[PDB]
Amino acid sequence: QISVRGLAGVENVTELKKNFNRHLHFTLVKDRNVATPRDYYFALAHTVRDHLVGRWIRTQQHYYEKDPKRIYYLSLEFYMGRTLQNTMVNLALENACDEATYQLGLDMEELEEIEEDAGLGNGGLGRLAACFLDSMATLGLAAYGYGIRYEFGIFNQKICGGWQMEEADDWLRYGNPWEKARPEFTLPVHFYGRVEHTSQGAKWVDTQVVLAMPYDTPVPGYRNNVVNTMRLWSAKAPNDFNLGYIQAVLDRNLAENISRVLYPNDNFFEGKELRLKQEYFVVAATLQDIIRRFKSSTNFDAFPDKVAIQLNDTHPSLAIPELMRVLVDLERLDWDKAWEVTVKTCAYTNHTVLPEALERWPVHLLETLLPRHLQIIYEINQRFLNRVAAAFPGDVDRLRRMSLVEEGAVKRINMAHLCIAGSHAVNGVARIHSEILKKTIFKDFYELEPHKFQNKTNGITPRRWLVLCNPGLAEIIAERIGEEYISDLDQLRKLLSYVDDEAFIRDVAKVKQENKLKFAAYLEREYKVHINPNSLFDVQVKRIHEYKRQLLNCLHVITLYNRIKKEPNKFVVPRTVMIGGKAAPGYHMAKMIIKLITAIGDVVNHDPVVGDRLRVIFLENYRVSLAEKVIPAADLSEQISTAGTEASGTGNMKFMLNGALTIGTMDGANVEMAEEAGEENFFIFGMRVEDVDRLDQRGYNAQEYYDRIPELRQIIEQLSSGFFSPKQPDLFKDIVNMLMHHDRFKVFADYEEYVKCQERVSALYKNPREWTRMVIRNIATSGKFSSDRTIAQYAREIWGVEPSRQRLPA
Amino acid sequence: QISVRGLAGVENVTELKKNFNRHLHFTLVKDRNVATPRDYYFALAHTVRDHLVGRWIRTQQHYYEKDPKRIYYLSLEFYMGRTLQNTMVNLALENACDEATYQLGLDMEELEEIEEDAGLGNGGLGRLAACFLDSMATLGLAAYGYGIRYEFGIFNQKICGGWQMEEADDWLRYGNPWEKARPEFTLPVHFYGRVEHTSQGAKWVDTQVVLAMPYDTPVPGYRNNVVNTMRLWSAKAPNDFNLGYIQAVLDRNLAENISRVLYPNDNFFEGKELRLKQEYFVVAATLQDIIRRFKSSTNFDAFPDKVAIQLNDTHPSLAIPELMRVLVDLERLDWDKAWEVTVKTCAYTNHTVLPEALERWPVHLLETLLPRHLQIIYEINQRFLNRVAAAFPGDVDRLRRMSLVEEGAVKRINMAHLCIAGSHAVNGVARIHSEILKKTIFKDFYELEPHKFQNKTNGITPRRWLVLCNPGLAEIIAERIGEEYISDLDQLRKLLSYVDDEAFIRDVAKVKQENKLKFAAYLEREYKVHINPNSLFDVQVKRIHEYKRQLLNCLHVITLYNRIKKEPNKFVVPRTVMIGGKAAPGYHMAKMIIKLITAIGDVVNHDPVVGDRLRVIFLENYRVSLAEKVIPAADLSEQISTAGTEASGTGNMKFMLNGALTIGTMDGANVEMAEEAGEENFFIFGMRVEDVDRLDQRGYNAQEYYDRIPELRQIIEQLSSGFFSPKQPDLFKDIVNMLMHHDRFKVFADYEEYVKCQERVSALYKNPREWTRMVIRNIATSGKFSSDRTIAQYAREIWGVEPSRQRLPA
Numbered sequence A, B: 001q002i003s004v005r006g007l008a009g010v011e012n013v014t015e016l017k018k019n020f021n022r023h024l025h026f027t028l029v030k031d032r033n034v035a036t037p038r039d040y041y042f043a044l045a046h047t048v049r050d051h052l053v054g055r056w057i058r059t060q061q062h063y064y065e066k067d068p069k070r071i072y073y074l075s076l077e078f079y080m081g082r083t084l085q086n087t088m089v090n091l092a093l094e095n096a097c098d099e100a101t102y103q104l105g106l107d108m109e110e111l112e113e114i115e116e117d118a119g120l121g122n123g124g125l126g127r128l129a130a131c132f133l134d135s136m137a138t139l140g141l142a143a144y145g146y147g148i149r150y151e152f153g154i155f156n157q158k159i160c161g162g163w164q165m166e167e168a169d170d171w172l173r174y175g176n177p178w179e180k181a182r183p184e185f186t187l188p189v190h191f192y193g194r195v196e197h198t199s200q201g202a203k204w205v206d207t208q209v210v211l212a213m214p215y216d217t218p219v220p221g222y223r224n225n226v227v228n229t230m231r232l233w234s235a236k237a238p239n240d241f242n243l244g245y246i247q248a249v250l251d252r253n254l255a256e257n258i259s260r261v262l263y264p265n266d267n268f269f270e271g272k273e274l275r276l277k278q279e280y281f282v283v284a285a286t287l288q289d290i291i292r293r294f295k296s297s298t299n300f301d302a303f304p305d306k307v308a309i310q311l312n313d314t315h316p317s318l319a320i321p322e323l324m325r326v327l328v329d330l331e332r333l334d335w336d337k338a339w340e341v342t343v344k345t346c347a348y349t350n351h352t353v354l355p356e357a358l359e360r361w362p363v364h365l366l367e368t369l370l371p372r373h374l375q376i377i378y379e380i381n382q383r384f385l386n387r388v389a390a391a392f393p394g395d396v397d398r399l400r401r402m403s404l405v406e407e408g409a410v411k412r413i414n415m416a417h418l419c420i421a422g423s424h425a426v427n428g429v430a431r432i433h434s435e436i437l438k439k440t441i442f443k444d445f446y447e448l449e450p451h452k453f454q455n456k457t458n459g460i461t462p463r464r465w466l467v468l469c470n471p472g473l474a475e476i477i478a479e480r481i482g483e484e485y486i487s488d489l490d491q492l493r494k495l496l497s498y499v500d501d502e503a504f505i506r507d508v509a510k511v512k513q514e515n516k517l518k519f520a521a522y523l524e525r526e527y528k529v530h531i532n533p534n535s536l537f538d539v540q541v542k543r544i545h546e547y548k549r550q551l552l553n554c555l556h557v558i559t560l561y562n563r564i565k566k567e568p569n570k571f572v573v574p575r576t577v578m579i580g581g582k583a584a585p586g587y588h589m590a591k592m593i594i595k596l597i598t599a600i601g602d603v604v605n606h607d608p609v610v611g612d613r614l615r616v617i618f619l620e621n622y623r624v625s626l627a628e629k630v631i632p633a634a635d636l637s638e639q640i641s642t643a644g645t646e647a648s649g650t651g652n653m654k655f656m657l658n659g660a661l662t663i664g665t666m667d668g669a670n671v672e673m674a675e676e677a678g679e680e681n682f683f684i685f686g687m688r689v690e691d692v693d694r695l696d697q698r699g700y701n702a703q704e705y706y707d708r709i710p711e712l713r714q715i716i717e718q719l720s721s722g723f724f725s726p727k728q729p730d731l732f733k734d735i736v737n738m739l740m741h742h743d744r745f746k747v748f749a750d751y752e753e754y755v756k757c758q759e760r761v762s763a764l765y766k767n768p769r770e771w772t773r774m775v776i777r778n779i780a781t782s783g784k785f786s787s788d789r790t791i792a793q794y795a796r797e798i799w800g801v802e803p804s805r806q807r808l809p810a
């Protein structure tokens, strides 16, 4: 059908059809008479999977032959989403499979919707790991993703009575055709026990054993025949476990609960023992696997030359003391040599400066669960502080500020300090974020070892986030500049010479209108809700959090509603405001924000006077697959976090690449996006980081804004009086109280400028031609935000390896 | 290689090899360089499985087209063992696969040993269900086996310090290539709740829901292209289950524990709630499946004409009240009509008369877990007793004896009485057993409804128990009379005309010697233990129980040892005594019997004076796969249960079919075996049932035997003094006490005759030629014990269907 989807050759279509029928018969054990849509989906999945195996086997054989330096990306989250379409795109099989299924009398798009999302992540951090794996394979790096195979991923969100309800994400229910169990590589992981100090070295004994069984999933690079591996560990009890008889067998569940479920917290630390076990479980199994592969290449001096370990946040921070344990206790290396190897092998990526998100584990927990690691951490701390004392003699406060051990109510271990001390590189995820790290929270560390600190601005993969979710846009672009940009996004700059091209302007606007019509139809199909496709699609999708300020968006929506009610027969640019995202189960305020959104919609969407001029819809169960649908249909991207709180943001990049203009604060990657496109082509507003600091020094008083802004006062009075909750007048009392007395994120402070800025947005939308020309200027300069650029920087500046765009023989 | 293993055609061997390589590549994702023996086993399993699918799909389509009466065999146990070789045998692919793997440079026998046994059963009862499925498919019946897919089957037995140690049987660890999940047929099962009586009928509400997910396994008939289905249910929690968040997800384990593990009790009732849940779980899911299939053929009058439900023991007895519940509460049929349909649909098989094995569930348990079923059971009881009262006016004691409800400490429901009342046929499993049912335990019921009682003597499948485990014997037999006997075992009688044939006599003896050499080698291979292949292989394998009297065997062994020590230089026929079997985890006496066996071996096997004249070995982890190895190598089969206790026995039939002579009591099927072969060709000894009754009436006093038999007294004194347990002199005090003061099975009473009989056995073994001629007379008359004969009788006399030997187009 479309160019960028590859060729539909005669031979290939014929081959695909016969293999599809073979799998339906032999694999699914069914015939066309009793086969269900799900049966057809699996028949197609197995058919596409077959095309991966050959490349998968030779890629790994290749690495064995060439023995290049290996990159190990450790993360407790991999937000993969669906795999079928992504695999077809990277193998250039989309059109052939589309044709083949068509001839079999089937609609491939219908079958694609049957696949469950692999929701092994919460949001940005988990998605970043997924985009990175794609880019590493596309850049020919010998990379491996290591994580946990959660039985239950992020919960499915249901909205009942306007409230969020959570239900288990049993994604493995019907089976996963993409994974391959490798029980032959099962490894033992130890817990509890005690430390014995013998003649030669310490020994960790009397431990409880839990087995780690790996499951491998293929990660195909973009049309380069490279297929890397994502290995996820599953917990298994040993057969002699607890061995009444029946009860002993049933208690196996205890040990296996380790890989049962993903903790649903986004940017928030919850110090639960089960979480600590998950963190050590992935680290312990992964390192044994790494060392095994290394020995199968005694000379640990060359370990850093053949191995690079990237820690995604502090979640896998235990890799540092665990590597020391193995080298010192098992391999018998002297401490100094072991430490040298560890530091040169490990690199750490920091993701958010919010204090409530930092991992600080109680010493009593580590003491009971990992006694040897606690001892190693104390020793690391002792030697690190000796270095600090020698560099800054007499600076006693610096010593306590930098310690890995925090004193107080309960002693805790600051995992971020542990990661900085044991890594040769520490990076932030956006220029402004990395600068904040050096200027504030890690100032002491930067002064001691300035060379360790770097910046690696985040990115997104243009495969899933353009070609896959927005084929129409990828096509009109390819028509003008070719297909090379798909793996070299910087080439999009060539589109700048088309900003005045009437044909192009018209095509860009047509693609957007088509995406909006498709999404508008989807809303009625699966969610039965009417919306006007001619309105401006104003969307904010991301996890619900106070710092992301979905509340500021709500205030604007209510402002628009009150203005309309005041002057009913006055023209206003029609808008469909869409807000979506999940709230962590125990985050009360976030759950109240969701209720507020649906409550506003209940009032606005049923007011006769408003008509189709304003609609407020809450996008239920926002996840990767839904993002792929709504982002291509958006006109306006809301990135309005308080300056200095959003480390980077990645959703913002997805919107920019798909033809939406951005309204946001100078926070995270927004700053670099505006810099790339030009501030005149971005809708910037609000306080800058410096402004926020000035306000804090002075003392933030929300009352002041309430007293001086009539429109704001009206809104707060409506909320307090029960205007949006008739049967429950004080339902939103907690929200009003927080906004008025303890708003850590200064919602009111940016209210006026935000509303003003939104007016400028509506003004531009009234001029279709100029709105589109600004869109083109955004798409044309979004190249810097490809994760291929990000990974190339990690490879050269941190891992010490060169990326390759060379194809492998298929 | 051998005739009975089919042809190794040029085309087929070529096809098998390419498909084997295809699976190793695409299915296992490996190459010949990294493939392990397990990888090769799976490659072979998937290759053979492919040959099943076509026949499986058309067999089921066939039943849909012809709509024959369906037979549903409900059992909580299906002791299947391995599936690879059995599948090749029934598809006539053994030689082709042997050749194909040979050419690939692989040993098929080595690969077959890699497959895990499907140990979803405890012993005879579970194995009977497995043999039955094979015969039903071979006889072309539209039959379905319904059970539970236990995650953990019967525990693996380890012997440590002479004691039994149990370890979890994680048989699904590496995956099961034979099963096919059918999540599309997932059904809800209800528990707890309460009963609401409305205007029209009662309603079961406020229940907890557990999902039942079916897994289908193919059951191939012998070379007739028929492939039936064994459907096993797995428990799954609903996604809204219990929906802190984390804990709610982790608590899903509670509900899913239902299908977690098989209760390891053999011939013993343990009234645990979890077991009751398993029993209802299988019954509830199965009946919904049956009714669905029935409606997809309103007219429940014809239900009994299209459906037959066979209850294997009382374990699935809840099918009766559950069928009534559905018909009355859901379909709205009047009670009388519903009862008529139920009785005509259900048939019940009784398996043992031991009182401790009878299921008698506490009313308080049924009251809380299945409130509606308890009400239905009371109503059934009320109407049944009204019938009894009318038939035997004034016989008040008969009323209390026949009640389904037992009064006393705690009220209980006698499930056997429930089954008799609600079934149109009740059968015993051996002639003597069925007679005992009518004369004793079910006398009252027989007098009320004599027509209901029948006999169906057990049998074993000649496919697994001859062709598969003893190809050498099947071959020399085929050479003389053809291959027809494999599916018509009665033809073995033709071998009687070869009893004087010198060539045949020599071949029979050669095959046995070969089997013994092979087994003797196996013992050293996997268990490192030396034995003399020239000795008489005396074996007793079956679950450890007091009624089976492994203790009587022990007394004989010790007698032989004491006699040798007394007259060292006197000649005696060499023997290797082998005893094997598992003991239920909580059965103390059985565990003590195992310890006694190993203790005897410790003394006997290391006594210089004995030499290789006597060896005592305990066969560890006795299971189906081990039975297939030891039975073909046996010379003497020990079937020595106290007369009247072994309902039938089936191991006895396996030994008779494989060339071993039998020493046993006139109990269970032993009586019919001796009758078929002729008492002169059997080694019968001990009390008959009538003798046991006389002793009980008089009062059994073990002391008498001890006082009058010097050799017996010596043995008991050795046991008491610590002769077999030096470091622990009183280790066997419990055994001696039981034998002397409360032996329910009269071990001493049969001691003298047993030892005398064993002397006659040794006398015959000294004459190779005559021993073999007697063996031939046994094999020649073992035809009656084929499960094909058993199933043909069930089909004609109970289910109302005609068996067919017609092939289906492949």
Ligand SMILES: O=c1[nH]c(=O)n([C@@H]2O[C@H](CO)[C@@H](O)[C@H](O)[C@H]2O)c(=O)[nH]1
Binding pocket: A265, A266, A267, A268, A356, A584, A586, A587, A588, A589, A590
């Ligand atoms: O994901 C979450 N983010 C949050 O900000 N919180 C918040 O943490 C605060 C510090 O303990 C509490 O005071 C708040 O009541 C709580 O909502 C959560 O409980 N969960």
Ligand SMILES: O=c1[nH]c(=O)n([C@@H]2O[C@H](CO)[C@@H](O)[C@H](O)[C@H]2O)c(=O)[nH]1
Binding pocket: A122, A123, A124, A125, A126, A128, A265, A266, A267, A268, A351, A352, A357, A429, A458, A646, A647, A648, A649, A650, A668
């Ligand atoms: O637990 C967390 N979850 C997250 O999603 N993040 C996020 O990681 C992203 C990738 O670097 C950043 O772009 C986001 O700004 C950050 O909030 C965190 O920093 N921490």
Ligand SMILES: O=c1[nH]c(=O)n([C@@H]2O[C@H](CO)[C@@H](O)[C@H](O)[C@H]2O)c(=O)[nH]1
Binding pocket: B265, B266, B267, B268, B356, B584, B586, B587, B588, B589, B590
């Ligand atoms: O499988 C088993 N078979 C048994 O015979 N027993 C027996 O049941 C008897 C009745 O309660 C007890 O008195 C015995 O001590 C026990 O070993 C078991 O505990 N388990």
Ligand SMILES: O=c1[nH]c(=O)n([C@@H]2O[C@H](CO)[C@@H](O)[C@H](O)[C@H]2O)c(=O)[nH]1
Binding pocket: B122, B123, B124, B125, B126, B128, B265, B266, B267, B268, B351, B352, B357, B429, B458, B646, B647, B648, B649, B650, B668
């Ligand atoms: O729990 C039980 N397990 C058993 O193995 N049996 C057995 O079932 C067999 C098949 O009918 C019989 O041949 C055995 O004699 C009987 O003990 C029972 O009767 N009960």
